[PDB]
Amino acid sequence: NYQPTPEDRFTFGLWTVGWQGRDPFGDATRRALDPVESVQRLAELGAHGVTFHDDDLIPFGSSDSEREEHVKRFRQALDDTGMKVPMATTNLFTHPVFKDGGFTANDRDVRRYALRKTIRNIDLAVELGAETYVAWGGREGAESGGAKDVRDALDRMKEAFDLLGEYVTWQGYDIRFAIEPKPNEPRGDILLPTVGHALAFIERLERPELYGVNPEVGHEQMAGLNFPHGIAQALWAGKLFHIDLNGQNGIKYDQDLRFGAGDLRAAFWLVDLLESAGYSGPRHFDFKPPRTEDFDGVWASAAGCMRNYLILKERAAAFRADPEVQEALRASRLDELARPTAADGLQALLDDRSAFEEFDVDAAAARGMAFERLDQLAMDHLLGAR
Amino acid sequence: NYQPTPEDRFTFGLWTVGWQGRDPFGDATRRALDPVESVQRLAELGAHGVTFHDDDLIPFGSSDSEREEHVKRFRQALDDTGMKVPMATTNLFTHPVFKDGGFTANDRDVRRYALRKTIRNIDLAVELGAETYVAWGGREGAESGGAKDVRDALDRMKEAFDLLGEYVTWQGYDIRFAIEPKPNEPRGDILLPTVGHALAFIERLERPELYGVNPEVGHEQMAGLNFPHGIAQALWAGKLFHIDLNGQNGIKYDQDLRFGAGDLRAAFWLVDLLESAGYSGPRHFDFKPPRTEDFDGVWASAAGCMRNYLILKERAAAFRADPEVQEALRASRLDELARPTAADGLQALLDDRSAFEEFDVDAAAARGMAFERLDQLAMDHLLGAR
Amino acid sequence: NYQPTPEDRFTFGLWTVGWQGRDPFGDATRRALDPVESVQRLAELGAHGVTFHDDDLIPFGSSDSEREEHVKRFRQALDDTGMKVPMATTNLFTHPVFKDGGFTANDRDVRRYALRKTIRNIDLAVELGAETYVAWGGREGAESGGAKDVRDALDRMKEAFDLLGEYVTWQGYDIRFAIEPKPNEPRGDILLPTVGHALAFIERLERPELYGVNPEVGHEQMAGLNFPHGIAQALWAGKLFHIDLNGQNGIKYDQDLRFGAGDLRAAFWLVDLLESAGYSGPRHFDFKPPRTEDFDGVWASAAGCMRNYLILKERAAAFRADPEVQEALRASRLDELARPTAADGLQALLDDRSAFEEFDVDAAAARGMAFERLDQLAMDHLLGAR
Amino acid sequence: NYQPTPEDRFTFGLWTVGWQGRDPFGDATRRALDPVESVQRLAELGAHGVTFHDDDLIPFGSSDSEREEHVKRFRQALDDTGMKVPMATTNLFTHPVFKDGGFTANDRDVRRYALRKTIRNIDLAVELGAETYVAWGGREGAESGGAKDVRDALDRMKEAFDLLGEYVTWQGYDIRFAIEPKPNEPRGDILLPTVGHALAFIERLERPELYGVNPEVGHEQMAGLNFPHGIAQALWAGKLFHIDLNGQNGIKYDQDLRFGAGDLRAAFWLVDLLESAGYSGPRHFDFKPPRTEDFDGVWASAAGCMRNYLILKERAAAFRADPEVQEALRASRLDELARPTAADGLQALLDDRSAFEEFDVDAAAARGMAFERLDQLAMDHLLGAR
Ligand SMILES: [Mn+2]
Ligand SMILES: [Mn+2]
Ligand SMILES: [Mn+2]
Ligand SMILES: [Mn+2]
Ligand SMILES: [Mn+2]
Ligand SMILES: [Mn+2]
Ligand SMILES: [Mn+2]
Ligand SMILES: [Mn+2]
């Protein structure tokens, strides 16, 4: 039995199991979910928490009076279930006003509005106890080369994130930003298309310590990149503030399959890296139950996300704890990889004849890496076949 | 006539027109070129310069006595032709000893050797007057998840680049490093797979000011990314120390077509961005004349790289100088994009009712971006159809 | 001036210039277009004709009384403008009932309904003078392996197309079917994903002569395939009954850019092949004016489709008519490619010693193909740079 | 223990466990294997058979005297081990003479030589008891549009295959052809890029019954296609004469990982389809032990191919035999998919009011497909987690 508990820190976005099934070629196949029904259903399945866009919780252009009701109802369901809200985000993509972006709209008045909408939701996020605010610049980019000067757009992107960091430090809020990269869709190309682009951009912000990345499995796999490798770079930089778990079958539209579906082997190595690095953040699922399913299928899909995480975890632990795997890791010299190349300095390296002149290149070349035996042990553990 | 001159700063790698045509399924279709013949042939076509891997100039495991001869012969041809050497690089991929990498080989003795080989070639690079040293970590990565701990590998990557920066500052050399990203091939995944990953990594080096990126058109297009957008981010960060120009038909093996072939529209926007940013570095071609061609085809292919750059340049200039394009850029509000969102500060933004409360979202939403008319003007200029 | 006349046979679907701009992450940015208005506007721009899905013309769940009002209004606009209707299609993707397909829905009663919906629209198509009925099995496929037995689905696919061919021969209708391949979106994988799969399936139908393909530029490029190559195979097989022209930037979601946008080179070679094969069918545009645009941008986008076709046509003709190109085609032995390999028969081939034992493989190997000089001439012509 | 017996019909080409590790950017990492040794080692691991290119067995430009020495030694090893040779193929890609193709070389004398080379090896294939001759047109295609008229090339392709079918029927040989599709590499685009294109082409051959497809996992996945779907279409058409099993991580260069590696889910559904269709052909592995490995890694990699097939086979059987899965297949109406849509005929369909006018579209639309519960059961079985 791989039932999830409140300590496993599994979370879901109101727009994940609430997805109505509208796609580029098809109408809604499910009615809208009450955020309160989702909180209750997720608690029953063993979720720890939910996340939201402003617009998922508060219908766009709500009065301040209605706004309160929606929040108080949500608050009640959280108090009843003990469900947490670790992360919130702004919808800067749905409303037609954002057709050219939020923070990097060519229209300056739209950029100003985008910021006012985000700040309003940061206040709410903090009242609900969220420690991470996500920015997904889903409309930040172009279909055509002349439509967007990317250097001016990155200036506007920087200006926006710095203004938000300023707001957060002036209010003394205890909340950090996580930028969520995506290479394309709904735009022909999106700015900060990958984990790398987003990490590089953060290093140019007034207050870089307030910002990290929220990488999504599917987003990196849409550019054909190794999601585990990107996560490893985000950890190496100390910038993995959040994660979005889902499935994707390689390079095509953003599928948002339940976690474990799509690239199962990458899902294995992902969980192996998160567990072995001791990532303490929430295990957030940003997935869409396919539009073929009714509400029973929606909850089965959500339950599968958590099950597949727990099954993969157990197999990754078994893999790492197996003495035959540890011997195989030494045979492949993963231990030598973890050792400094030249802790003796550069002078000692320049003087060491074993490092160049008297290096036996042919003897080193002939040493097998034994990576195939190691990978078959990983396969045997993943499949439970030893 | 779009003949190239010595001021256009066109350069070529000895391994570009020297490619013998060996591919994964096929033997060499051309004999090896004498580096001296390539220098002479490139000068005739109007090239400004050549670049080299250590191994292109000095056959692997040459005596110091032979090493000199090869260098003196090369030096003579450069002096005769007045051809420059603006960039040099190390071959850390061909020899079987590098089958698991150079700087991030699991084997510590291979990492030490990789560094000694690179340092030796930095000395030569400086003697030949190169101001940029390129690292292409072509063997840095894995085919399988357990073979490479990416965090340990990035530590070894950092250690290597810091040791090289230390060497360069201790010798008082006037040379900068450019890291060349690639997503895959010859490895299943390569570390620092994109411009973004490489920019982020540089920000963690002891001496970040000594390092930039050498992005390649084909490399970013192999991950399905917008090469112009990546170049714009590299410029915004002040990190475009070099560039590799070639062609690629989307997501597949590294084709290295002559510049202008593959994604012609991206080539147009690339030249438009390089020219309008006033990039002053060399226009370096890293391409492979297809293996179908003899030496006449090789030199036609090289000449085409330079021709296509000059033709694209002229069309991009005409595009930017055309009053109808300038009016179309204002209609699409590219000028508003270049204006600060809130130079009035955050307090003024929080107080401005036109930025939220009294913002007419529906009136802003209804404004067409007029991006299609702008893009058809760009198309008309590229095609010379106005 | 690259003006479009009636002889150009340019066509557009109601759903193209009428796309409201709803995508998976955003609401409509434009109000709906009255089909009559679209007919009148497309006539103004120099279109020869329009195409429609049943549901574009007749709102889903219309009374027969309303049905006739919409058809009579449409009929009037066609009469007034002299616009033709060469092609019609069924919407078997939008309504939630089709979430698992039309012809290959797991639910037998949905398959039966899909057929009754299609047959009703075939009657209308013929009344309006259409000679081609298009089937786009957009919902035929799966997100998961257990959901769809592909052999059973192809039996149901075959059954459906044979029943439709039976109906058409019973009514003596003067109308042929064109199957429109697509690899994915909105399904994870779609059945008959390419031109090849659709051609192969047709050869197993009761009446193969009634069926061809309707290939779409963007659809083949979403699988990273060469659209000109696929079109050449469809022509070689005498199966190119229709074509859908648009733009796509490699492997990602279905973009539906205006023709000429995306892969400009492939657009050049496409027009070169259609013109030189004398394809006599309509030049149909299935594109979406991006959601950034208002109605002026919509009509500019449509006008650009036709403009870009006529520019490419002129440059391809100049290419083929240039004596230097014809000499270059002989140098690359395109004329030898057009000659039978062994019109002397198998026995003469087996007996010919110049064909094996007396074949100088090294002398043949050394012959350059001169493909690069030929391709630079094609580039010079496309760009108008000779 | 998932041991491989002779009944498993596991096969491997000489070129698989004998790949020396040369790639576009690196030298050989392993010495050549004597074909005899490979036969002896593959028998030890529980292989049933081997396959070969002419050039793997007989070095190019061998005397007839040497030719017989290599064949007699090979023959002896087969006799000693009882290893079968079910399949043979021609090398029409390695030698520089094939730089523009074999059967569709622009040079007519190269096409003639290609045929004479193939026919010579068909004689050998039959002497060694092969029932399948594979054609991989690896050099059939282009890097540029002007280099190859695809209609002329398909005429030459047809001519070649018809001449070979004529030879085979004249000799009364008991041998069928399997065409092996590949989308690209080593050519920019290859002719017959997918299973669909190859099936469609076969239907235009003089003797279609002599020809089927040899689909490769990695080849279809390089175009981002569903390999199980393509295999199902090949079975539906009765054209699956052979199969090549390996691994591939989505859209990039041809990786040739061991079977099970790359897309593990697709490997599961593939084995599920081969087993449940009762495919009786050999399970042939066309893979490359990565160049990181020595000979122990080579044999581990080969053993892993067979192990991973037998694990998947066991999990697919358990999946299909599980009563909860059979109930879930009925809940998802896979049984309704297997029923004729209208065995009552077109007239009864046209007359049935439950099929249109009396069809409750909203009631049909509301029915969940329960595909997610079915897919989680498939996942649980694959992982051995029930
Ligand atoms: Mn997503
Ligand atoms: Mn997300
Ligand atoms: Mn390259
Ligand atoms: Mn390069
Ligand atoms: Mn489309
Ligand atoms: Mn279409
Ligand atoms: Mn292969
Ligand atoms: Mn193969």
Author numbering:
A (entry chain A), B (entry chain A), C (entry chain B), D (entry chain B): 2 to 387
What wording appears in the published article?
We work with glucose isomerase (GI) whose nucleation mechanism has been suggested to follow a two-step pathway, and for which groundwork on the characterization of the pre-nucleation particles has already been performed. We use cryoEM to follow the nucleation of a point mutant of GI (R387A) where the surface exposed residue arginine 387 is changed to an alanine. The steering torque that guides OA can often be attributed to the dipole moment of the nanocrystals. This is not the case for GI because the net dipole moment of a GI tetramer, i.e., the crystals’ building block, is zero because the dipole moments of the monomers cancel each other. Our in situ data for GI exposes crucial interactions between nuclei mediated by OA that determine the material properties of the final phase.
We show that R387A crystallizes in both the I222 and H32 space groups. In our optimized condition, H32 forms hundreds of microcrystals in a mother liquor volume of 10 µL within a timeframe of minutes. Almost immediately after mixing R387A with PEG 1000, we can resolve nanocrystalline particles (1min40). These nanocrystals are facetted and their FFTs show clear diffraction patterns that match the predictions based on crystallographic data obtained from macroscopic crystals (cryoEM: 6.7 ± 0.1 nm; standard deviation, n = 33; X-ray: a = b = 6.64 nm, 60°). From this observation, we can determine the lattice spacing along the c axis, i.e., 8.3 ± 0.1 nm (standard deviation, n = 10) which is 5.7% larger than the 7.83 nm c-spacing derived from X-ray diffraction. Based on the crystal structure of the planar H32 crystals observed in cryoEM, we identify the plane as the dominant orientation. The 3-fold screw axis is perpendicular to the plane resulting in 3 distinct GI orientations. The nature of the crystallographic symmetry is such that identically oriented GI molecules do not engage in lattice contacts. This constraint poses additional registry requirements for OA to be successful, as highlighted in Fig. 4. Even if two proximate nanocrystals are in rotational alignment, approximately only a third of all configurations will lead to proper docking of both lattices.
